[PDB]
Amino acid sequence: EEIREAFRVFDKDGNGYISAAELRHVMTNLGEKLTDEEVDEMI
Amino acid sequence: NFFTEGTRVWLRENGQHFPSTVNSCAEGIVVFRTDYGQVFTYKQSTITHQKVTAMHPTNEEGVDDMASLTELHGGSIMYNLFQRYKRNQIYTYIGSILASVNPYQPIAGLYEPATMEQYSRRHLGELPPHIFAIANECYRCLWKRHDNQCILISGESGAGKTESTKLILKFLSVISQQSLELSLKEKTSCVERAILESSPIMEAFGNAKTVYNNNSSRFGKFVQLNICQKGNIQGGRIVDYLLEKNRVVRQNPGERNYHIFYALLAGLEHEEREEFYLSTPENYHYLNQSGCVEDKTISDQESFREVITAMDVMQFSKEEVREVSRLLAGILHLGNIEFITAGGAQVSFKTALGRSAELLGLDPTQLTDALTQRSMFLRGEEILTPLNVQQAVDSRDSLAMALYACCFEWVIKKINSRIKGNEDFKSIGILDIFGFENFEVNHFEQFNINYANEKLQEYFNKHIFSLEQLEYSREGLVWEDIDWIDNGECLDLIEKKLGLLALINEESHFPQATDSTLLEKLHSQHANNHFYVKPRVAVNNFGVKHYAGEVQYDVRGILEKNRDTFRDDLLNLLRESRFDFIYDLFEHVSSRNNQDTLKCGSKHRRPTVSSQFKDSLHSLMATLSSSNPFFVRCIKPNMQKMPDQFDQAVVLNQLRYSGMLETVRIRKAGYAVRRPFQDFYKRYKVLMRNLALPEDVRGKCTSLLQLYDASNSEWQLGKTKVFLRESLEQKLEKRREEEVSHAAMVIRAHVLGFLARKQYRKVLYCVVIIQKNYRAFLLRRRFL
Amino acid sequence: DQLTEEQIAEFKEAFSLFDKDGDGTITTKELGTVMRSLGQNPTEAELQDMINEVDADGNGTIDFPEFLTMMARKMKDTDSEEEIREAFRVFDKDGNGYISAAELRHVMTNLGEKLTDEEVDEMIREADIDGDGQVNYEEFVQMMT
Ligand SMILES: Nc1ncnc2c1ncn2[C@@H]1O[C@H](COP(=O)(O)OP(=O)(O)O)[C@@H](O)[C@H]1O
Ligand code: VO4
Ligand SMILES: [Mg+2]
Numbered sequence: 001e002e003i004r005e006a007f008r009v010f011d012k013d014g015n016g017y018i019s020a021a022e023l024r025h026v027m028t029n030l031g032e033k034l035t036d037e038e039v040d041e042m043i
Numbered sequence: 044n045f046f047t048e049g050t051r052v053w054l055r056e057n058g059q060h061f062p063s064t065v066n067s068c069a070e071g072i073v074v075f076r077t078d079y080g081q082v083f084t085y086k087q088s089t090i091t092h093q094k095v096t097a098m099h100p101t102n103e104e105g106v107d108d109m110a111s112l113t114e115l116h117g118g119s120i121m122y123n124l125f126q127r128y129k130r131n132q133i134y135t136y137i138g139s140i141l142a143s144v145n146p147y148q149p150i151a152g153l154y155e156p157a158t159m160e161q162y163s164r165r166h167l168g169e170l171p172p173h174i175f176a177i178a179n180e181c182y183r184c185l186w187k188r189h190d191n192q193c194i195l196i197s198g199e200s201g202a203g204k205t206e207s208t209k210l211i212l213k214f215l216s217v218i219s220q221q222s223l224e225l226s227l228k229e230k231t232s233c234v235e236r237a238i239l240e241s242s243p244i245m246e247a248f249g250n251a252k253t254v255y256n257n258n259s260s261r262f263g264k265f266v267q268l269n270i271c272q273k274g275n276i277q278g279g280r281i282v283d284y285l286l287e288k289n290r291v292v293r294q295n296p297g298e299r300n301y302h303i304f305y306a307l308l309a310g311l312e313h314e315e316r317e318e319f320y321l322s323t324p325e326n327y328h329y330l331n332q333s334g335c336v337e338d339k340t341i342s343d344q345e346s347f348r349e350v351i352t353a354m355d356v357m358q359f360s361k362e363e364v365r366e367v368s369r370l371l372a373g374i375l376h377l378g379n380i381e382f383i384t385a386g387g388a389q390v391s392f393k394t395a396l397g398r399s400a401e402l403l404g405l406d407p408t409q410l411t412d413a414l415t416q417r418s419m420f421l422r423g424e425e426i427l428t429p430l431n432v433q434q435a436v437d438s439r440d441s442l443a444m445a446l447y448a449c450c451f452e453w454v455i456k457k458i459n460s461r462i463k464g465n466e467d468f469k470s471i472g473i474l475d476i477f478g479f480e481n482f483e484v485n486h487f488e489q490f491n492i493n494y495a496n497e498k499l500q501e502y503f504n505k506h507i508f509s510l511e512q513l514e515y516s517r518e519g520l521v522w523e524d525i526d527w528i529d530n531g532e533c534l535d536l537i538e539k540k541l542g543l544l545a546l547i548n549e550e551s552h553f554p555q556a557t558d559s560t561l562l563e564k565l566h567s568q569h570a571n572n573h574f575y576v577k578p579r580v581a582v583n584n585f586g587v588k589h590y591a592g593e594v595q596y597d598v599r600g601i602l603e604k605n606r607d608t609f610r611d612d613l614l615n616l617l618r619e620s621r622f623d624f625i626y627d628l629f630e631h632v633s634s635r636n637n638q639d640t641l642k643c644g645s646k647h648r649r650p651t652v653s654s655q656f657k658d659s660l661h662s663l664m665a666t667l668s669s670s671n672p673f674f675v676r677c678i679k680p681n682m683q684k685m686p687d688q689f690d691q692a693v694v695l696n697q698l699r700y701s702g703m704l705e706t707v708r709i710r711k712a713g714y715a716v717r718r719p720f721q722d723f724y725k726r727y728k729v730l731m732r733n734l735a736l737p738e739d740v741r742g743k744c745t746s747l748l749q750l751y752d753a754s755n756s757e758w759q760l761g762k763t764k765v766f767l768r769e770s771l772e773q774k775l776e777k778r779r780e781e782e783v784s785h786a787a788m789v790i791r792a793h794v795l796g797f798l799a800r801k802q803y804r805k806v807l808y809c810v811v812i813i814q815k816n817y818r819a820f821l822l823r824r825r826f827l
Numbered sequence: 828d829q830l831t832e833e834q835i836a837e838f839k840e841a842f843s844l845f846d847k848d849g850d851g852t853i854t855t856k857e858l859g860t861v862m863r864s865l866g867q868n869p870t871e872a873e874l875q876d877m878i879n880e881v882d883a884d885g886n887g888t889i890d891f892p893e894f895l896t897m898m899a900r901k902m903k904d905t906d907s908e909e910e911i912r913e914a915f916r917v918f919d920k921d922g923n924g925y926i927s928a929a930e931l932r933h934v935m936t937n938l939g940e941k942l943t944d945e946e947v948d949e950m951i952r953e954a955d956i957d958g959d960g961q962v963n964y965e966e967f968v969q970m971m972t
Contacts, residue, residue, distance in 0.1 A: 003816055006809035029843040031807055032814045041821060729917045782917065784938065788870050789914035791939020795859070796868030797971045798950055803841065803864035 044090045046073075051098035053118060056083055059695065060118030062098065078122070079691050102126070107172050108136040108770075110711035117704055121695055128680060128689050134172035137703070138710030138769045140507075141177050144678045144694075145203040148686035154210060159217050166777050168770065174207055174675065178214040181673050185270055185469045187776070193472040193670040197499060197701070198677030199591065200478040201256035201684065207675055208266070208475040209242055215268060215276065215471065222274035234462060235276050238268070240353035241458045247306055247350045248451050249283070251290055252299040252335065255480060257684070261287040261301070262451075263476040263495060265663060269466045278464020283455050284476070284495070284663070285656050287488050289604070291374065291447045292440040294333040295482065301447075302346060304330055307371055309340040310347020315365075319372035320398045329378035329443065357461045366624040370450050373402035374443050380414065388415045388435035403446075404622030413616040414438050441609050445617070449628040472670060474499070474663075479591045487604040490596050491656055493589050494537055494544075498660050500530050500590045500701075506672055507706055511713065518717075518761030525712070527705040530590040533574040537587070541568055543575075544653045551605045552648045554639055558583075558598040565598075591700050605651045609635040676701060714759060714766035720744055723765040727775060729782045751775070830899055838898060841865050842891050852888040861894065867901045871940055911971065915964035924965045928955060931962060 010026075011018045027039045046052055046065045053060040054075045061081065066074040073090060075083045085094075099113040105127040106112055112119055124144055127135055131150045135142045152158060153173075162175035170176065181192045194211055196204045216235035230236065246258065253259040263284030269277045294300055308316075308324050316322075324330040354364050379395035382388045390396050390411050400407040412427075414435050419426045430438065479496040480489055508527045515522045537543045546568060550561040565585050569575040576586025576593060586595045617629040638649060678697050681690040698704065718726065720740040727747055734750075736743050744765045748758045751771055758767040767775075830838075841864050845857045853861060855878050862869055869877070877900075881893045889897075918926045918934075928951050935947045954970070956963040 003813060006813045009805065009809050010813075025847060026810060027814075029840070029846075030814070031811050031840065034814065038817065038821065042817065725920060732913070786914040786917040787934045787938035788872070789911060790918075790934055792870040792873075793868045793911045793914075793971055794935065794950065795940070795942075796863040796866075797954075798946070799860055799863035800866065803844075806844075 044092050044095055045087065046095065046097070053093070053096045053098055053114060053116075054083060055094050055096075060096075060114075060116045062118065062122045105130075105132065105135075108138065108168070109142075109707045110136075110138055110770075112707065112711075115704070115707060115711075117695060117698055120698055120703055120707060121691065124678070124694065124698075125689050125691070132171065134174065136168075136172045137707050138713075138715060139167065139177070139180060139673065140706060140710060141172065141174060141673075141675045142678060142703070143174065143203055143207060143675060144680050144689075145201070145206075146686055147680070147684055147688075154213075156217065159214050162214070163218050163221065166773050168773055169777075174210050175214050177673050177675065178211045179218070181471055182215060182218055182270075182274075184671060185274075185471070188671055191470045191472070191670040192673065193474065193667055194673045194675065195474045195499065195502065195667070196675040196677060197496075197503065198478050199255070199679055199697070200253065200259055200480040202478055202677030202679045204475050204478055204677055205246075205250075205258065205260050207677060208264070208473055211473055212239060212242070212266065212268075219270070219274070219276040234278050234464060237356055237458075237461045238266075238276065238279055240356040241266075241281060241462065243346070243349045243353040244357065244454060244458060245281070245283075247303040247346060248301060248454055249286055251287075251294075251301050253480070254295075254297060254482065255682070256478075258302075260475065260477045261290055264474070265666075266473045266475070268471045268473075269464055270469055270471060271465070272468045276464075277467060279462045281455060281458055281462070282663075283451075284659055285491060285652075286448060286451055287477075288444040288448045289488065291444050292329060292378065295484070296333055297335050298333050299335055300330050300333075302343070303350070304371060304375065305340075305343040306347040306350060307368060309343035310351070311368065315368065319369060319402060320376065321372055327375045327378055329375060357458055359457060363457075363624075366622075367450060367454070369402050369622070370446060370624065373399055374446050376402060377439060377443050377446075380439050382415070382432045382435045384432055387429040388432045390415065402622075403617075404620040404625055405616065406619070409616060409619060413612050414442075417610070418612050438610060438613060442613050442617075445609055445613070446625075446628075449632070453628060470670075472667070474667070479589070481592060481594045485594055485596045486599075487596075487601050487652075489594065490587075490601075491652070493587070493591075493594055494656075495660060496591065497530060497534055497537065497589055498664065501534055502664055502667060502672075503674060504529060504531075504702070507674070507702075508709060511709065511715075514717075515713070515761075515766075518764060518766065520714070520759050520761055520766060523712075525705060525709045527702055527709075528590075528700075533588060533590065536569065536572050536574045538657065543569070543587070544657060547601060547605055548648070548651050548653050551602055551651050551653075554637070556602060558600065558602055561602060562598045592696075605653050606637075607635060607652050608637045611636040676703070710769075713768070715769050716772040717761070717764040717766045719764050720760075727779060729786070730775065730778055830895070835895065838865060838895060839891060842894055846891075852890055853894070855882060855887045855889065858889050858894065858897065862898065862901065865898065867898060869901055873901070908968075912965060912968045915968065918964070924963050925956075925961055926964050927961050 007018060008016075010023070013019065023042070024039055027034050027042075028036050045068070048065050048068060050065040052063050052065060052075070054063040054077065055061075061075075061077040061079070061083075063075040063077045063083075066076045066082070068074075068087065071087045073085050073087045075085075075095075077083070096114075102113075102119070102122065105123055109120060109123060112123065124135060124142065127133070128144050128146075131146065131153075133144045133146050133150070133153075158173075159175055162170060162173060162179055165176075165179075167176050167180045177194065181194055184192050196207045198204050216239055219235050220230070220233075245262075245264070246260075249260065249262040250258050251261050265282040265284070267280045267282070269279060271277045290298075290300055299305065304327075305324055308321055311319070311321065325336065351364065359367075376395050376399035380399065381391045381395070383391045393407075396411060397407050399405075400410045403410075414430075416427045416429055419428070476495050476499060477492045479493055481493075482489060504527060508525065509529075512522070512524055535542065539545070543565065546564050547561065550556040550564060562583070562585060565575075566577050569585075570577045574588045576588065576595070578584045578586060578595065581595065583597050583599055584595045585598065586593050611634055614629060614632060614634060617625060620626045620629075635649075678694060681688045681693055720743075724731075724740050724743050731743065731747050734746050736746055741760055744760065748765070748767070748771075749755075751774060752758060757771045758765065760766070841861055842853065844864075845853045845861050858877065859869065859874050862874075877897050881889055881897075915926060916922075918930060932947060932951060935942060935950070936944070951962070954967065955961075956966055
């Protein structure tokens with residue numbers, strides 16, 4: 001359940017869809033960089 | 044008192060101070076040449092200090108505010124206006140009072156929308172004097188002051204009151220939008236567009252050519268604009284005062300009837316013109332009698348187009364426009380009815396009668412009978428009595444006037460219906476009266492117009508001088524009283540019990556009374572009144588010493604004009620109209636038939652023109668008395684309607700009688716702005732942030748004011764209020780605006796940095812919770 | 828003065844978020860948004876004066892080094908617990924510490940900068956005292972830290 005809270009605020013769409021490429025652009029540049037290898041698996 | 048050749052001096056030549064140059068000073072003779080071309084010669088020994096005084100440096104190419112003048116006299120004031128007039132600067136301030144000299148020509152850029160925008164964003168005094176600056180100050184007062192505002196525009200016929208009103212309305216319409224939101228669909232459907240379009244309609248129906256003005260206002264107008272708290276116009280109301288209905292049937296030589304008749308005849312298409320049996324204006328008695336004419340149409344054709352457009356904006360249906368056209372055509376044909384005596388009045392030729400009866404929806408034999416005979420019923424059979432030709436002409440003309448006056452009232456109703464809106468916050472009222480007029484021959488119409496001008500001058504004096512100096516006295520200010528010429532006694536002569544109106548009204552109620560019996564009473568009662576003039580030879584006249592000059596009135600016509608009788612026979616006839624528009628106008632109209640007692644000497648009496656007008660003016664002045672006023676003084680530079688022609692004698696007269704000299708004195712020395720100590724302190728607290736303030740409010744006010752003027756001359760503390768000059772208040776309002784705006788920037792920047800920080804911290808949190816959860820979900824999936 | 832490695836790293840984080848293009852350049856419009864995201868609340872004026880220095884040519888871009896400089900500059904001022912409090916206090920009248928949402932909305936829309944009503948109504952309806960019936964500024968100032 002502790003995921004749906006952080007995805008309902010992760011889009012400007014306001015229709016339950018977090019435009020793919022934008023999520024990839026969020027990670028690695030973030031507070032806890034994920035070496036893009038973790039990012040290749042969240043696709 | 045000796046001045047060398049070429050010296051600039053004021054030469055007092057007993058009447059006024061002349062701007063002059065020393066032409067020569069030799070052999071004990073001094074010659075002065077005035078800037079108006081006059082040459083005055085004197086023995087040098089006879090010249091004393093004023094006779095002659097030195098002229099201040101350049102004075103200076105003019106001064107924007109006459110309170111800045113060094114030399115204060117009529118000569119000085121006029122010269123300032125003259126210098127400015129010569130360079131097309133028609134506006135000059137006297138504090139927040141505005142002087143406007145009619146240019147009688149367009150001045151490039153003066154009233155352009157780019158200029159309106161520039162004035163909307165500045166304070167009074169930051170730009171050259173302009174009517175737009177007054178309209179803006181007035182508008183700003185809706186948030187600076189707690190009351191409604193009004194703009195009162197004074198001046199003789201042709202001075203520029205109507206043009207001034209239109210400019211104020213145009214400016215306020217523009218400023219109203221600002222206050223959001225645009226779209227051309229909005230701006231063409233607009234309440235402000237409708238308010239602006241009321242002018243061409245009202246001018247066509249209520250204005251006419253007179254000797255003093257080709258577009259003379261023949262009615263008084265009070266426009267009230269209702270403004271909401273957000274700053275936009277919600278709607279309005281127009282109140283009309285005493286339309287000159289007699290102009291419909293007769294005009295003095297060289298004048299015209301109402302513009303609308305000429306516009307209708309010049310503007311209608313061939314088909315409608317033929318439908319209403321209309322031809323040229325020369326063919327109509329109601330348009331041809333003055334001999335003017337003197338125009339090859341064209342200006343009237345453009346006015347028709349302008350009216351039609353305005354009526355469309357005003358939501359007059361195409362049928363309503365045709366109905367008004369049909370009524371006006373009916374009036375024109377009605378005027379062409381001629382009578383002959385054949386026991387007694389008889390309609391001579393049937394054509395004009397037939398056309399008028401058709402257009403008015405009346406039966407021609409019924410119309411003929413109503414104009415030529417009077418009806419009486421006796422228990423209970425009808426008795427028809429013939430009228431004589433004078434009575435038939437008076438009936439025809441009373442019918443024409445009734446139709447026009449009712450149509451004008453309906454048009455005003457329609458305008459008011461269109462501009463109707465809420466009254467949620469405050470209002471700005473603008474008064475455009477018919478101006479002072481003194482013709483070769485003056486009748487009752489001029490008496491009423493001049494009375495209204497007199498009543499307005501009394502309001503101007505009450506507010507500028509009387510109440511103002513009374514407030515200074517009550518508040519215990521250090522003040523030297525300024526004298527001023529009060530016209531109160533002239534109004535007393537007109538208005539008091541046994542006064543001019545009282546005697547006119549009393550004689551009107553006596554059927555046996557004539558204009559000659561009235562004049563006897565006027566002379567007997569008022570010969571010794573300082574403001575009344577019993578002519579030494581002119582047996583049909585009486586004079587009134589109006590503020591703007593002595594006017595002689597011919598009594599012939601006063602009783603009949605004041606009575607304003609309309610036969611019940613004619614009202615009954617109109618109610619027979621098959622044309623619904625006409626019936627609707629007369630459906631509930633009150634009877635105005637001639638009364639013949641018996642023993643009905645009872646206190647009421649039927650309302651007369653005078654009594655209804657005195658009431659309306661009193662109602663108006665009472666409304667104005669509760670609003671904060673702005674004054675505009677329109678000055679006619681000449682009597683020839685000419686541009687670039689400043690008649691110094693004509694101008695000086697207006698400056699003198701209107702009290703401009705005394706006005707400059709009180710605005711230079713006085714304190715037009717005042718606020719209770721706490722109110723002043725609470726408003727300007729922002730400006731005291733860097734000051735070491737005392738515990739008492741009087742001291743707090745002093746601390747700020749001392750920074751602006753340590754001499755204590757531009758402000759004073761009264762018993763309860765801080766008094767300050769308009770210039771100082773304007774200086775304080777500009778600085779308050781600057782600090783308030785700077786404070787809004789400080790908070791606008793701090794909240795924007797709160798919102799962005801909140802969402803940046805939220806995104807940084809939402810990701811660290813998904814990154815920790817994915818680091819776990821993928822570590823379990825790696826173990827499988 | 829000096830910015831600690833932890834500080835520089837914290838700023839490159841916020842920079843890279845707005846640097847979608849991945850070129851190491853954010854737009855002039857974004858400079859405000861980024862600085863604000865990191866604490867610093869520059870005024871529209873302060874922001875323009877910063878741009879006019881960096882971006883004379885009119886390219887509309889800001890590299891990380893020129894941003895860092897803008898940051899360390901605004902960091903020096905310092906003003907102040909009673910400075911925002913003083914700006915809000917001009918919006919009174921009675922010294923009660925109360926400014927109405929009506930004039931506060933007017934400050935946010937008309938004055939300062941013209942901004943989206945849907946974001947400013949949420950900035951009021953959520954960030955307001957008495958739940959509905961007006962806002963306390965000294966509380967809001969304290970909350971704005
Ligand atoms: N501001 C002005 N600029 C140019 N011409 C003007 C101005 N004011 C008046 N006039 C001219 O003088 C005429 C008389 O002015 P108007 O306002 O109609 O007179 P009144 O004071 O009698 O209402 C105008 O209709 C116009 O031709
Ligand atoms: O010409 V006037 O509008 O002053 O009557
Ligand atoms: Mg007029």
